Amino acid sequence: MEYSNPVIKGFYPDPSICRVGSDYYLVTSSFQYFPGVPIFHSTNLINWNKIGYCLIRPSQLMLNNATNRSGIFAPTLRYHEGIFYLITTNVTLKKNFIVMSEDLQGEWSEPIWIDGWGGIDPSLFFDNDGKVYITGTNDNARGEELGIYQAEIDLKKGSIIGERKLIWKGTGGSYPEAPHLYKVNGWYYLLIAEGGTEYGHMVTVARSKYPFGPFESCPFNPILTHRSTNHPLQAIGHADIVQYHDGSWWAVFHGTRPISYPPKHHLGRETCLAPIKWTDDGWPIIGYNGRIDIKMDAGYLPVKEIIEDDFNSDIFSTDWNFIQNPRLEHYSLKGRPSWLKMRGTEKTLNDINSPTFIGRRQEHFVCNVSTLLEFKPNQDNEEAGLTVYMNEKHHYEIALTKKNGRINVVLKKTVGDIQVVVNSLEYFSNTIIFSIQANPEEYKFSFVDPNTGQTYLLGTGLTTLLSTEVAGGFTGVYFGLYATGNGKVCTAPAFFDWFKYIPE
Amino acid sequence: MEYSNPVIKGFYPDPSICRVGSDYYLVTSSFQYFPGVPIFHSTNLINWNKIGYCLIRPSQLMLNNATNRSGIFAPTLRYHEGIFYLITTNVTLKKNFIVMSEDLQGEWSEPIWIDGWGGIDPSLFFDNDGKVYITGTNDNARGEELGIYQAEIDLKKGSIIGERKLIWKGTGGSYPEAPHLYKVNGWYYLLIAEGGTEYGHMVTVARSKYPFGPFESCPFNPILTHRSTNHPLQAIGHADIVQYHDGSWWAVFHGTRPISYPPKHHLGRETCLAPIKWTDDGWPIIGYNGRIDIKMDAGYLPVKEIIEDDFNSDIFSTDWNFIQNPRLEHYSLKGRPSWLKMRGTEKTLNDINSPTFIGRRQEHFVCNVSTLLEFKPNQDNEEAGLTVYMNEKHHYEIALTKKNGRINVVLKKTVGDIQVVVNSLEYFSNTIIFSIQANPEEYKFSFVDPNTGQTYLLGTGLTTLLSTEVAGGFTGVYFGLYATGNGKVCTAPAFFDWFKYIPE
Ligand SMILES: [Ca+2]
Ligand SMILES: [Ca+2]
């Protein structure tokens, strides 16, 4: 049997995995998007169902001033004695914290803020002697030597016990990070990422008889990397290991699927899966001697996408994210039942601080995305539509707007410091269907007059100008519904009847 | 004593070096630019003076349809018994050839086309038994196994003797290339690049008692790389070795100086220098155990930039390049003595096939570039100015033009599929000074009214949208003087009095 990588497509980076019996749970980083820290469930490591998010309340997730360069970085999920612990960093606040749950269908706890624990990529390990260890990166604010730091932690108090200790510098790659401590067959293993989460990314491992070291570098490090290859999967690393309930070992990690030359990726970092074999002399090797592929053998894992939202429920589906904490009063599923009613503010897609926007990840290179919008702009500033969005300086939109008394459908782009209206056609009714056809190299923007079914191609845009390499930050493209008054509050409400995401 | 890398700043990739006595010569790749294959001279490996170009005649350099993805790829320069051999690939033609010279102040020979020798990165080695070997990459047209291929060559005939043989696959990095064969202390060494000329770039070496192998991989390969580091120098490789006349060994190679995040570079790949030490057991190691720095120790090398062209000579300076083979009739240094007179054609900066353009490399992150232009456009299509140019889809320009009867100074950008006029101001005289201030993140476009000395900032543009990562291809930014009639021949001549390049 085979499976395909990525196992979780689209923007799902920094996967951390946790087994409870014959169930598996996985979390990913979310940066400036709300809610934060998606959590998935699987019984076979290949097929994952999103069960919700870990950070859903303002008290857990403070994203004011957060961007696709900041907000929530790598999360780690662990389970001990019936309690789940999610530990992560809000980089906008420069603070590490934990939330807890004993019931994954309910919400997680208020955060426990870990004072005097800096850096990113915090992780937890529960030892057999009752001690709990927190492990993370160097803290740049304190001018620490680059490497992996660890201390004992008191989980109730949110406090460190004893001293914060450098335990391993890694093999000499940049940005030694993503540390996880495990104990397997009498050895402590410290698994990390080096080289940065770009084309240099790799996984390395060390081991020790003691949890604080000294750690011996694996002699065949790195144990996973596509650096210096032209494989379709790149930037592979940030791994977390699991022993499946049949006894076999596996790693989850992320990688990208870049296109063009030089390589550029727009679907974010995507979660992948590979087997682990343990060498006779006690070291893990991931995949096919440190490499992986799009098609992989499933071992004995038991092997087993069109999304249409009609907005019929008064609860938002788990596909939807907002930019930072949303202004809840500007989105309503009750004002017009069976529609989403949005109130645009002065903020636009060029502003970081929560414009009126709701979006879902692009998870496929080839897909068709559409929405029906009712919008009668009252004044020239007023605008609502459908966006392909990377960050505040990299986004394309097709929208209804008003200029000099006339209603126009427009195609608008922001790329870096360039803001352009690419095309504009007069439009003569109150409802419109917007559709975007994505392929690897371009998005094609069309509108349909609902009353006739006639489609019109308004224009096109390059995927590569929305790529992470171009745009900056740590995220993937979203498709979003938005409204704005372009420096004033938007007096016309925007009503979206439905949203469709149809992958090829 | 110290020196700084890069030793040759700006777009100077794929350096090949050749010693003749106490003189050193070095060549670089030039892609679609004319003339082709710059050649430099040094006596100390650190300071290089450009002495001209190797490919200066249409018979040597056929660049019709060439782009910054094609044209002339890596050159190799060798010397035997008073004759210099320059061997390279015109990738637009998919052909390898050699030109020869016995006098570097004169022009090189007509090409000898090497029939049935495919791939890129051809190199020559003259053995002590009188045999000459050609070495290069796999030929994708023939579905060859990836690796380094070699044969004996008859240099007079331009023909291969005997069989084309795969001699080494490399260590397992992508794109094994840049092969050079040497013979040192009884071993044949095969030095190559792997990983691609981007963030995976590295140098590896193998050795054999025989020129065709079998080759043993160096046990500490790679011997040079910045992969998986955050060093300011990246993408390092494509090395060629020299023994300096004091007996010490050195490598030249290229690397980039990227900025922003993810890393993006706009100055091209730049030539660097590092020492070699030979291990007791007969392997070379480059630099500081396989890494290098911006400041390096000069060993015993004897250690030792404002450019102003007034156009007073009827010979173009060696700074100037054209896009492909120029239409010579459209550039004149004689029509108005002490000025460059250019005739714009229907072709624009968006067209690959030789628009009227002359340019010089950006060689510094911080510099000020200016020109005085006399231009009285006769019709609305007509345009002349100063460009910052990466390729046909990535360039910014400040220019004089005409629209609806009125003369305007404009700032124009092409980025991918976006073509925009960023700003436009009416202008009321026949001469103008254009100036661009570059810094690492942005170019600032100003014009001066020559008659008053008053400067005006017309606008700005991001360096990152001209970077190779964004734009594609294999080159660095140029600053150019251009004219165009935007689909018609430009009826107004453009006269440039001078050009200044003032680095910080
Ligand atoms: Ca509906
Ligand atoms: Ca002059």
Numbering used by the authors:
A (entry chain A), B (entry chain A): 1 to 304, 311 to 510
Q: Can you quote the paper on this entry?
A:
The β-1,4-xylosidase from the thermophilic bacterium Geobacillus thermoleovorans IT-08 (Xyl; GenPept accession No. ABC75004; EC 3.2.1.37) was found to be stable up to 55°C. The enzyme has a broad substrate specificity, and is active toward various xylans, xylooligosaccharides, as well as the artificial substrates p-nitrophenyl-β-D-xylopyranoside and p-nitrophenyl-α-L-arabinofuranoside in the pH range of 5.0–7.5. As observed in other type II GH43 enzymes, Xyl has two domains, an N-terminal five-bladed β-propeller catalytic domain (residues 1–304) and a C-terminal β-sandwich domain (residues 311–511). The active site of Xyl is located at the narrow end of the funnel-shaped central cavity of the five-bladed β-propeller domain. On the other hand, the residues in subsite -1 are fully conserved, including the catalytic base Asp-14, the catalytic acid Glu-177, and Asp-121, which modulates the pKa of the catalytic acid and keeps it in the correct, productive orientation.
X-ray diffraction data sets from Xyl, Xyl•arabinose, Xyl•xylose, and Xyl•arabinose•xylose crystals were collected to resolutions of 1.70, 2.10, 1.90, and 1.70 Å, respectively. Additional electron density in the Xyl structure suggested the presence of five independent glycerol molecules, of which two were in the active site. Of the five glycerol molecules in the Xyl structure, the one in subsite -1 exhibited the lowest average B-factor (10.4 Å2). In the Xyl structure, 7 amino acid side chains (Ser-4, Ser-22, Asn-49, Met-100, Asp-293, Val-426, and Ser-441) were modeled in two alternate conformations. In total 570, 471, 531, and 516 water molecules were identified and refined in the final models of Xyl, Xyl•arabinose, Xyl•xylose, and Xyl•arabinose•xylose, respectively. One calcium ion was defined in each final model on the basis of its electron density, coordination geometry (pentagonal bipyramid) and positional similarity to other GH43 protein structures. A metal ion is bound to the carbonyl oxygen atoms of Asp-316 and Asp-503, and the Ser-344 Oγ and Asp-503 Oδ1 atoms, with three water molecules complementing the coordination sphere. The calcium ion likely has a stabilizing function. In contrast to all structurally characterized type II GH43 β-1,4-xylosidases, protein assembly analysis using the PDBePISA server suggested that Xyl from both crystal forms is probably stable in solution as a dimer.
